[PDB]
Design a binder for this molecule. Sequence first.
Ligand code: SAH
Ligand code: SAH
Lengths: 196, 195
Amino acid sequence: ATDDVSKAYSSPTFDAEALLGTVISAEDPDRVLIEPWATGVDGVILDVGSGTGRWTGHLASLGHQIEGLEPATRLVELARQTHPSVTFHHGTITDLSDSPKRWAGLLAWYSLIHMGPGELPDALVALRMAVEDGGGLLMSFFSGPSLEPMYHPVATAYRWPLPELAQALETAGFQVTSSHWDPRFPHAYLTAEASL
Amino acid sequence: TDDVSKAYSSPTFDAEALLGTVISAEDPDRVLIEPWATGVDGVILDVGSGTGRWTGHLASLGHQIEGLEPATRLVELARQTHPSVTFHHGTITDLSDSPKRWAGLLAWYSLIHMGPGELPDALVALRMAVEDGGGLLMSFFSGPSLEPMYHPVATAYRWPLPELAQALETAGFQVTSSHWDPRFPHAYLTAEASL
Ligand SMILES: Nc1ncnc2c1ncn2[C@@H]1O[C@H](CSCC[C@H](N)C(=O)O)[C@@H](O)[C@H]1O
Ligand SMILES: Nc1ncnc2c1ncn2[C@@H]1O[C@H](CSCC[C@H](N)C(=O)O)[C@@H](O)[C@H]1O
């Protein structure tokens, strides 16, 4: 559940600064995925579960209009001191439904990995209501042949088969425009477009 | 550059879930690693031991072994999980700093991120860390041509037997055995340190 997960990430026994990192490496393979996507966003990007803000600051430095959303108290505060010119919102995905705010695109980089079938559905719905119609979504997650839990050092994670996740997205108002996954690893990612 | 090792320490990579922390008694890799380890008459060095799953396993079987891991979070995890086993926090190249030598080297998928411009010298450093006539057991990704391949941490590489065997011979290693199923990239081989 997000409550226990968020406090696990803000736990003083977890130094995200060193583990997650506060700056992106020039050799980071995710750059070729996120950077191109970001350029395609015509408006303010919302980095969902920005954590230490490493990608938020990186994209902001490259001229992108972007803000962050992070429920982990220690992390969001940490992100502000590290990236003083970037706006970081302290809150959860569901909190987004409490405001009329809407962004042009959504970046959820491994921020949805701790949500199972009883939680992701509602999160996707809130996300859809937080992005402009036709707006984009880039998310990375863990996939596999079955929808099942998976050990993770911070909090329990979940593997989501493409069929189940794509259906959840469609039900939520998102259409998958691209996806990628290598069966030898759970790591996977996809792009979607806000629709009906 | 410690970008690779740091990426391996990241919770996002989730080393404990992808590689594991414990060795299943039914793991098929056991029949490959154990027979080899038994042949090493001395201390084995687990190069890029990660979570220390194999290091603890072989240690519990009576094998004299130590681990080498640059990934901070992983090396610290290995130490708490196997308090009886020694784990050195360093990289293959750091081996040149110490005159220490091991009787055998186990490199289970710890060299996959090394392309044609890095593997050659990494193998030289390995040769310097093993006793003459010592043994080397390594697993890697193979294929019809030396090309890069996808991997969550960083670019990985497929090494054809010809190219890899030649790099090993140049490094002072002689391939004693090799295995590979052309259907899958997974491969492995044993080698003996020259005299
Ligand atoms: N509903 C939710 N909304 C936002 N963040 C959430 C969430 N549930 C879990 N998280 C979190 O998502 C993050 C996942 S780990 C870091 C992800 C970040 N995009 C990066 O690549 O560095 C953590 O900061 C954690 O607090
Ligand atoms: N130069 C280097 N020296 C030592 N380890 C290295 C390295 N370059 C990459 N590695 C790493 O090698 C490991 C490969 S993945 C895990 C391998 C381990 N033998 C197992 O089977 O579980 C990672 O822990 C990673 O940090």
